[PDB]
């Protein structure tokens, strides 16, 4: 699954190629990564979608479908950041099949 | 494979008899429709088991006779001749389908083949005297 203590790599959105850590995950499936932000009116570095209106959620609203964590396949993506105190998870992290 | 099988689960196999429409059959479907013997059909059924009566009133009646010995145990010839052999008196009857908790019986020459085994029984009728005499043996 996806965690907040992990780094993601865009692959489709206009932010394709950008790197960053996962800010937070909502029960909606969307994930906001430290980097994919938008320029508000008074030019305030705050993530948000591009649409006119009053008060709307923050976050650029990224999708786990176009992201890139640890995909077991041939892609253009590269290294990705990932607990350790678990021990058993370290074994999976050591394996080139899981994490 | 991983494709939804054409079928296979519960209502699979053979059934009972002729092409049954739905569950055991009805007569008067739901809603409204004749279904009945017309007239004042409702309150309570017609018959009662007896009559009014006129035939049950006081015809050539009788009465309940006392319990009988509940004799009358078919022990026909053959089926005992073409079966087993000698010694067939009061001791070897359980082997055959002749063994009532009560007592007595009778012999009814169903066949004529000689055996010529002897048989007690405790009863006797016509034909009983015949056979087991011209063939041998002694009845009681």
């Amino acid at each position: 699954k996806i965690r907040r203590d992990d780094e993601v790599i865009v692959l489709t959105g206009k932010d394709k190629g950008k790197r960053g850590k996962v800010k937070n995950v909502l029960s909606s499936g969307k994930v906001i990564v430290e980097g994919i932000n938008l320029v508000k009116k008074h030019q305030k570095p705050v993530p948000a979608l591009n649409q006119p209106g009053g008060i709307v959620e923050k976050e650029a609203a990224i999708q786990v479908s176009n992201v890139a964590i640890f995909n077991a396949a041939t892609g253009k993506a590269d290294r990705v950041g990932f607990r350790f105190e678990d021990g058993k998870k370290v074994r999976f992290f050591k394996s080139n099949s899981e994490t | 494979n991983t494709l939804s099988p054409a079928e296979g689960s519960k209502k699979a196999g053979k059934r009972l008899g002729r092409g049954i429409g739905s569950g055991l059959g009805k007569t008067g479907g739901r809603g409204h429709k004749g279904q009945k013997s017309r007239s004042g059909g409702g309150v309570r059924r017609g018959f009662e088991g007896g009559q009014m009566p006129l035939y049950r009133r006081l015809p050539k009646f009788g009465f309940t006779s006392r319990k009988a010995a509940i004799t009358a145990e078919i022990r026909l010839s053959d089926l005992a001749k073409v079966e087993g052999g000698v010694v067939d008196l009061n001791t070897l009857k359980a082997a055959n389908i002749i063994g009532i908790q009560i007592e007595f019986a009778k012999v009814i020459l169903a066949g004529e083949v000689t055996t010529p085994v002897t048989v007690r029984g405790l009863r006797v009728t016509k034909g009983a005297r015949a056979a087991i005499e011209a063939a041998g043996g002694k009845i009681e």
């Binding site: - | 009972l16 739905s22 569950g23 009805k26 007569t27 739901r30």
Partner: protein
């Protein structure tokens, strides 16, 4: 005659068994037409307790009416009520057994000794834990198209095949004509045949 059995390797021959009964394709097919889903609550006429309540309880003018668990029954003028026009005490079936049901239960057992039918499998079949092994033993058996039919066995319910195409697992003990031949076709095992013989 001698029904040739098959091992896990679907050998050409193993043991032998058979059943004696005048097969009736018309009757067996006359079997696959009666209750695939025919025990789903009928709608008879005269089959239960039903004891009056007499006077008392709750004040209010009311007449004698069938009351089962606050549910009306046997009362013609109410869902599931008395059917004045007797003869057909249930729900729409078919003008139709003591010899067709059972007789078929026997005739079916004879349908197995037929060429263009199933085949007996050794007892080791029930052992096969996996399901893929079955698909294989059914492929080499040259009867992979039997999945298009159904499947059976003996002892306990063979789980390892409950997934295979069309498979209503059942035991030789209590095998109604149903499992005997799903859609006038089937397949059983060794011990099964023996248990079914009786």
């Amino acid at each position: 005659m001698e029904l040739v059995l098959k091992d896990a390797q679907s050998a050409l021959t193993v043991s032998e068994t058979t059943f004696g009964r005048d097969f009736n394709e018309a009757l067996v097919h006359q079997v696959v037409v009666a209750y695939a889903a025919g025990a789903r609550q009928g709608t008879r006429a005269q089959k239960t307790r039903a004891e009056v309540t007499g006077s008392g309880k709750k004040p209010w003018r009311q007449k004698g009416t069938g009351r089962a668990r606050s549910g009306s029954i046997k009362s013609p003028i109410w869902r599931s009520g008395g059917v004045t026009f007797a003869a057909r005490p249930q729900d729409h079936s078919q003008k139709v057994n003591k010899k067709m049901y059972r007789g078929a239960l026997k005739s079916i057992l004879s349908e197995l000794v037929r060429q263009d039918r199933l085949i007996v499998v050794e007892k080791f079949s029930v052992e096969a834990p996996k399901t893929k092994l079955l698909a294989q033993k059914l492929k080499d058996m040259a009867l992979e198209d039997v999945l298009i039919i159904t499947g059976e066995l003996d002892e306990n319910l063979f789980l390892a095949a409950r997934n295979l195409h069309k498979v209503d697992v059942r035991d030789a003990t209590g095998i109604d004509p149903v499992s005997l031949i799903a859609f006038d076709k089937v397949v059983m095992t060794a011990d099964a045949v023996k248990q079914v013989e009786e």
